Amino acid sequence: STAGKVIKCKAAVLWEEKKPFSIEEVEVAPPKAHEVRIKMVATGICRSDDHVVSGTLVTPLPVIAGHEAAGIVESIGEGVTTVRPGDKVIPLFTPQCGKCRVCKHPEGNFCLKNDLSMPRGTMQDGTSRFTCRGKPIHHFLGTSTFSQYTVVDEISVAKIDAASPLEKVCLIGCGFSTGYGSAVKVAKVTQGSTCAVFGLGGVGLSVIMGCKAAGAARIIGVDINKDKFAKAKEVGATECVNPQDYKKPIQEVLTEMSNGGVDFSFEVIGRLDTMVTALSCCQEAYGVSVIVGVPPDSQNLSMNPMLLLSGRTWKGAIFGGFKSKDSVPKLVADFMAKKFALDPLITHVLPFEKINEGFDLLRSGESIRTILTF
Amino acid sequence: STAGKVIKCKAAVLWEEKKPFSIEEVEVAPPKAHEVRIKMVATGICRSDDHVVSGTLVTPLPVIAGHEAAGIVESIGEGVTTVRPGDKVIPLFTPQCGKCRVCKHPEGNFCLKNDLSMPRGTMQDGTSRFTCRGKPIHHFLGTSTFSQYTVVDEISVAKIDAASPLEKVCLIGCGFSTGYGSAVKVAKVTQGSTCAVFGLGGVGLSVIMGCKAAGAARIIGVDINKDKFAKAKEVGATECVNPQDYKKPIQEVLTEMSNGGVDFSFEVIGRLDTMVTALSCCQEAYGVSVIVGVPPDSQNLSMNPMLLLSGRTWKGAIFGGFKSKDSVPKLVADFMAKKFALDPLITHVLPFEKINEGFDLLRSGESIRTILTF
Ligand SMILES: NC(=O)c1ccc[n+]([C@@H]2O[C@H](COP(=O)([O-])OP(=O)([O-])OC[C@H]3O[C@@H](n4cnc5c(N)[nH+]cnc54)[C@H](O)[C@@H]3O)[C@@H](O)[C@H]2O)c1
Ligand SMILES: NC(=O)c1ccc[n+]([C@@H]2O[C@H](COP(=O)([O-])OP(=O)([O-])OC[C@H]3O[C@@H](n4cnc5c(N)[nH+]cnc54)[C@H](O)[C@@H]3O)[C@@H](O)[C@H]2O)c1
Ligand SMILES: OCc1c(F)c(F)c(F)c(F)c1F
Ligand SMILES: OCc1c(F)c(F)c(F)c(F)c1F
Ligand SMILES: [Zn+2]
Ligand SMILES: [Zn+2]
Ligand SMILES: [Zn+2]
Ligand SMILES: [Zn+2]
């Protein structure tokens, strides 16, 4: 029995930037008041985890990364009311406190209790539940899912269907929900519209899924890796284009293809240049462009505000605009009811001990999502 | 008595940037097919006209500027169906052809026949109706209202109520409609919200009017000229701030004042730095910022796209988002029914012959709108 005790378990510790994860024993403290300790079942490899490795995202190190996952509650601290030991759960990298001005707003989801903006790498109480070789180890986004066991604040976990296949629904913890919601909730793609999706990884494929669900007539996938095109078409892309194939800038190509600009464009890469290209390729008077990707820390883009003055709308979002704790259980129920598919995003399934090999698959271009299984 | 004949009349010709207008005789050709010749009655001085003089806005010179006006149809070309001689009309600097993909879109207004994006300074047929000293003179935005007579394409004119006071409703041709629509149509300001309005000229005052009409609870005016604050409060500002009074950047001041950011902000000046400040000061998860001010020609702003990734929406618009020919007559009818006031915008009245004094008043900071009478 482990309840109320320190757990010694295996985790993937990132000691410094641009190094492999170290798979080794950590100590996981028991949960405090309003905290939940979770036995991990499956976690996906999201590009945002790689950004921590590459230094694209700045967060306190050493760290246990991982934010796209699912597991089973091992124990609860005093005062927890929303989950119980044995429940299937998804950690929420965007919390839902329910009390802040954002949580109370009908269209906000970026709860003020988040650890993204100005990352501390801690629990809500400003402390860590992790140690390794006698050193405190930081949390990541309140989730830290690259560990056999994590501790999360109650506002950072959702209870899901007891019959959920956790090796699939972990993707609802980040990439699926983000892409799908970016299309259906943030952009509000319309029936009959033309969409352009920049970046055909797990998140961009989920954007395509959402654009198709919303009834788009044309969905143009854009990627410099033509090996991504077949799966993009399988999930709804009507055309795919590789910028490297053209003498013209791809905003000009997409404007010509769409007879004057697209209805909706999505940046799903993380480059400043593609954010401006994606804005430019939407129709100047009524186009909408959504930033989904994460670019390098502290870098500004340059753009001409006449792109906006003519009528364009430019927005971005975290986690597809979904209020995380309300939405995750409903997305899992919708998946269980066959309303969308997750298998098209899963290219590789590896044991957790092969985390580095999973990152190498992402970095090489081979994979979409690798699911690590504990 | 003048139908089919060249009209000799006085106009304000701009031969050179950074110089006074020259009030002198021009020759105004009769209207060709689908053209309308208008005897002007009143025209406002909008800062965009001054942008032509300063080179902030690049359009071919020499030019007859003016775009905010009202007059009476003197004659119609072959095939004109929407106005008749003797009708009161407002020229439309944003056309409404009714046929292009923007005109057909429910939310588009920046008609593809516009002369704003890449100005030619001509009629729709690529020619000029104006001669001065034997030289062809450019049109401006298809309107050229700084003339006793102008010729406009049919898609650039709207018939208005025959009982309209033209010395008031000329403001519906640019500044009032732009500001009011930016709030009520583009931003869609909500009841009980907090708004910030950067720039308290004629357009920014019109934005305040729209925010108040939409039921905003707080409307914070921002201007470096504190002489603008009294009138801003008269039309609905709940408080005014001068960035020059503060040690900290005004985005930080406004975020503090609004307990974490405003619901809606508006840039109504034309500066790259205030466009980014206005975006920053709206709440990071659900705020909306609208660019109204005209930026300096060909200059790019610099900004961190993390401002959008958190959830902000950034947009701009021409003419308040209003489909011009549909909307202008309705706005005049609503003015006639006292649904909004125009007198708060009118600080000065001059004869057309004193156009240069009218620009001096705008440049000194003294005026809001000067209305010129022909
Ligand atoms: N906003 C959010 O909440 C959120 C959620 C999840 C992921 N992300 C970010 O979204 C982005 C995509 O994540 P992912 O799908 O896991 O990554 P991924 O699987 O690496 O996919 C990125 C795709 O972009 C392609 N690509 C790279 N450069 C270019 C280019 N110049 N032009 C066109 N295509 C290019 C690349 O070939 C690949 O297929 C990353 O920046 C993530 O950090 C954001
Ligand atoms: N989008 C459109 O369709 C449209 C329509 C009409 C006007 N415009 C533009 O909107 C802008 C405002 O026009 P207007 O109301 O006639 O001009 P205006 O009367 O010159 O008003 C601008 C106000 O900005 C104030 N100001 C100047 N610098 C700053 C600063 N750094 N911080 C805060 N306030 C400052 C200034 O004191 C003045 O009261 C101009 O750029 C116009 O070209 C756009
Ligand atoms: O992939 C989701 C995700 C984000 F969208 C971020 F903006 C971020 F900073 C991060 F750490 C993250 F995991
Ligand atoms: O004031 C209205 C107005 C604009 F909003 C412009 F963008 C522009 F180029 C212009 F000439 C103009 F008059
Ligand atoms: Zn919250
Ligand atoms: Zn992610
Ligand atoms: Zn049109
Ligand atoms: Zn104007």
B149: helix, coil or strand?
strand
Note if the bond before A62 is cis, omega within 30 degrees: yes
Q: A105 with B194: CB under 8 angstroms?
A: no
Spatial distance between the Cα atoms of A239 and A262, rounded to a whole number of angstroms = 13
- Closest alpha carbon to A71 in A135, A9, A16, A14: A9
**Position of tokens 């003498």?**
A247
Spatial distance between the Cα atoms of B151 and B123, rounded to a whole number of angstroms = 8
CB A26 less than 6 A from any atom of ligand 3: no
- HSE value, Cβ hemisphere, 13 Å, CA-based, for B296: 9
Which ligand approaches the C-alpha of residue A102 most closely?
Answer: 5
- HSE value, Cβ hemisphere, 13 Å, CA-based, for B38: 34
Output the residue whose Cα is nearest ligand 3's atom 12: A48
Which residues have any ligand 1 atom within 6 Å of their CB? Answer: A 46-48, 51, 174-175, 178, 198-204, 222-225, 228, 243, 268-271, 274, 292-294, 318-319, 362; B 309
Identify any residues that bridge with B194 across adjacent strands, giving them in sequence order: B218
Spatial distance between the Cα atoms of A97 and A103, rounded to a whole number of angstroms = 7
**Position of tokens 């399934």?**
A349
Helix (H) or strand (E) holding B203: helix B202-213
**Position of tokens 């890469």?**
A269
Q: What is the distance of C-alpha B294 from the center of its chain?
A: 10
- Structurally, what CATH architecture does the domain formed by A176-320 represent? 3-Layer(aba) Sandwich (3.40)
Nearest to A317 among B294, B303, B311 (CB): B311
Query: What approach was used to elucidate this structure?
Result: X-ray
- Closest alpha carbon to B13 in B28, B34, B2, B3: B28
- Closest alpha carbon to B110 in A257, A255, A312, A276: A312
Strand A7-14 relative to strand A63-64: parallel, antiparallel, unpaired? antiparallel
Question: CA torsion sign, A149 to A202 to A359 to A163?
Answer: positive
* Residue A108 in contact with partner chain B when CB distance is under 8 A: yes
* Residue B5 in contact with partner chain A when CB distance is under 8 A: no
Spatial distance between the Cα atoms of A195 and A211, rounded to a whole number of angstroms = 7
